[PDB]
RNA sequence: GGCUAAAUACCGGCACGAGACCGAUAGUCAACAAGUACCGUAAGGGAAAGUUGAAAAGAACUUUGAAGAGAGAGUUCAAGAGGGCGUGAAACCGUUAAGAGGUAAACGGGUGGGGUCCGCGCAGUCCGCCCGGAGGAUUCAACCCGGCGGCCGGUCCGGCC
RNA sequence: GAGGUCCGUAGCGGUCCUGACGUGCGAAUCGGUCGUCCGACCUGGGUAUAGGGGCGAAAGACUAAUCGAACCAUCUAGUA
RNA sequence: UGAAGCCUAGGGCGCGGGCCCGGGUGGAGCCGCCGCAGGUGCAGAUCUUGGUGGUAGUAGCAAAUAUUCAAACGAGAACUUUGAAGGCCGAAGUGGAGAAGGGUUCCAUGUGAACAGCAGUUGAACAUGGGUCAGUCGGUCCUGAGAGAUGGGCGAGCGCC
RNA sequence: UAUCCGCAGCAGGUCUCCAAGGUGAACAGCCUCUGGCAUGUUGGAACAAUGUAGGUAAGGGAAGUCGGCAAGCCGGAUCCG
RNA sequence: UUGGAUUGUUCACCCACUAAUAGGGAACGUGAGCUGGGUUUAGACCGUCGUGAGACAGGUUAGUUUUACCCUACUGAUGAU
RNA sequence: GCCGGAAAGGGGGCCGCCCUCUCGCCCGUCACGCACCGCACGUUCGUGGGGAACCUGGCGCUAAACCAUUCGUAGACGACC
């Protein structure tokens, strides 16, 4: 609808969008940061590998308490994880984006992720019961995902 | 032993009219399915909640997906108004760009450097009088005719106060 | 085959570990260990007693998680 | 031919309170001067209401021995259903049935937005429809502990004894 | 141990009926049949410290500690006494 | 620069060993490290005091010890220029 | 070509070379130059350090590290053998 950063060429680019998705915002943002600059096929392969725990997602900003792994050394970090539903949500969105590019009449095997953004969506409340008859929130953190692919060779 | 209208009172009730009043955290608790939802054995306690547009014209149709949800297409002046939709601030977050980074950060004074913009900067003011040179007009002073105005008549005539 | 008799189930209770937990499973729970268990026994329903009053084998205990004077509204925007 | 409001690395003025221009967004009203009036200026009050952070993807999802294989349906299976295997409750039960209480939770079909602190093809969730039959089971009848009128008494009185 | 009350599918609370086989004094504990269930609001990989709940320890035997706290010893039945 | 008997003890005293059984500080070091014996609530008993409710640097017995996942410091483990 | 150097290694001296100058230095003669019209950061070390590319040539070179896997002399996870 209204994209935060428009493409430099509206003809050599395709767009995809999703709102109010029940996936953790902090995990999804790091997955998007991991796949930010990749070719479409490389990104799809990497996302499959993450889902199968063959490659990690390096947790850089939201790293509090995250454990270490040996697979983040190839990212030049120490802490990584494998958020699989985070990976597959934007895998579905990537598939939608490539379908959009094919519909608009583009070269699918030259598309590079040029823009990707994860915003924070309205929270939905549940309730948890604590000691001494107290009630605390059990909130959730849905997110908005917004991505732009473009050709470059 | 007794009766008795008028002038007098009126935050309830049926209708009305008005205001230097309030303007949705205000004004009644209640602008809305409000003494409603809801809590308490009960007596009782008691909310939050307004706004698309002029008009639903409320997004046919193609396409990816199991679907939510997207990409096009279309309506509208405007979707940067898409069914909790007027405007859309701050705290907080994402991304892009620029800069920086071992005494937490921020701050005052003094410069320096770099940016973003502005000056619409880029050969730099005019204004009077006079001298000289080329010009061009119905053209100056004086005189006459008419109109208007300002000051007087040592004490002009007439009014009014 | 007697006993407000003994050991010991169900039930009723709540000693010690000063154990577990202590933003708990829980605004008093959990485990093991314990007391009593034919009697002043345990228990549902009905019924009576109501706040300076009730009821109390008496701890100022209980009276709807509130008790050395309950709760609700009002006097009340009480006084400092 | 664009008011209020809002944003601004744009230009300025004022010692200051503040104010004026430019740009953008917005879509219907607003301001200067002379007087008048006041529910008239917030950083605090363990202030009121609403919203948002760091903590933090952290604490935590450890009471009661236990699951595995194959198939089916399904877009999708650690969790649904069928079969097999291995276990538990162990007749003072994790069995079969009632009273108080609940009030449609009962049964069937369908759905997977929300809820069932993972997930779900399942559900006491949501949507459609169904379902409780009495001379001989109970209430209705009796009276118990007790409650309660009339006559009467007391009482300012509602009324009470 | 999910249709009731406790704010909740809350280890709490809430009145009764029926009651198999073996062992055994026994309605004790333990194993099974009829009936039921899926380990109690999740799973997977490892087996560090510290914990919680269980055990075992040479020689000594309360020297520990305010205090034998905690654990341990004893345990049923028969015959003496 | 110790092992013990008695005491809640600090202090004290005694037995034994020893080479010697010196003295002190760190918020009278150290309770989100423990314990809870003493003091130090609410229950009770005694003596003295008070007419009484009650009092006692007098004795006695029974009595809930909460929270770390934050920053630092420290102990280890990756890594970074 | 010969030597000269290790504490954090010497662009130095010497022996020959094919060549070229009577030029370099000091006094004199001789004229010439953007004489830019009084005016500032002028004059170097400097082919300075660093980063990208345009390049014509010659000489050469076609490696590892990490993940995945395995191991258990190691281990909470990383890490390590
Ligand atoms: Mg961080
Ligand atoms: Mg931490
Ligand atoms: Mg809880
Ligand atoms: Mg509760
Ligand atoms: Mg008379
Ligand atoms: Mg009279
Ligand atoms: Mg009038
Ligand atoms: Mg409002
Ligand atoms: Mg209101
Ligand atoms: Mg409002
Ligand atoms: Mg408003
Ligand atoms: Mg409001
Ligand atoms: Mg609105
Ligand atoms: Mg508009
Ligand atoms: Mg609008
Ligand atoms: Mg809006
Ligand atoms: Mg920003
Ligand atoms: Mg940057
Ligand atoms: Mg007895
Ligand atoms: Mg007995
Ligand atoms: Mg007790
Ligand atoms: Mg305890
Ligand atoms: Mg704890
Ligand atoms: Mg009385
Ligand atoms: Mg009694
Ligand atoms: Mg009183
Ligand atoms: Mg309008
Ligand atoms: Mg006013
Ligand atoms: Mg204000
Ligand atoms: Mg304020
Ligand atoms: Mg996690
Ligand atoms: Mg965790
Ligand atoms: Mg549990
Ligand atoms: Mg049953
Ligand atoms: Mg049944
Ligand atoms: Mg059903
Ligand atoms: Mg769930
Ligand atoms: Mg009566
Ligand atoms: Mg288990
Ligand atoms: Mg299970
Ligand atoms: Mg359960
Ligand atoms: Mg031993
Ligand atoms: Mg032995
Ligand atoms: Mg001793
Ligand atoms: Mg000792
Ligand atoms: Mg003991
Ligand atoms: Mg001290
Ligand atoms: Mg301390
Ligand atoms: Mg403590
Ligand atoms: Mg004590
Ligand atoms: Mg006492
Ligand atoms: Mg942790």
UniProtKB/Swiss-Prot annotation:
Example GO BP:
cytoplasmic translation
Alphabetized GO MF terms = structural constituent of ribosome
Entry keyword annotation includes Ribonucleoprotein: yes
* Top-level taxon: Eukaryota
Protein's cellular compartments: Cytoplasm
Q: Which UniProt keywords apply?
A: Cytoplasm, Ribonucleoprotein, Ribosomal protein
Give the main location. cytoplasm
Family, according to the entry, reads as follows:
Belongs to the universal ribosomal protein uL22 family.
Query: Per its database record, what is this protein's job?
Result: Component of the large ribosomal subunit. The ribosome is a large ribonucleoprotein complex responsible for the synthesis of proteins in the cell.
The subunit structure is:
Component of the large ribosomal subunit.
Its recorded name reads Large ribosomal subunit protein uL22
Supply the source organism for this entry: Oryctolagus cuniculus
What is this organism's lineage?
Eukaryota, Metazoa, Chordata, Craniata, Vertebrata
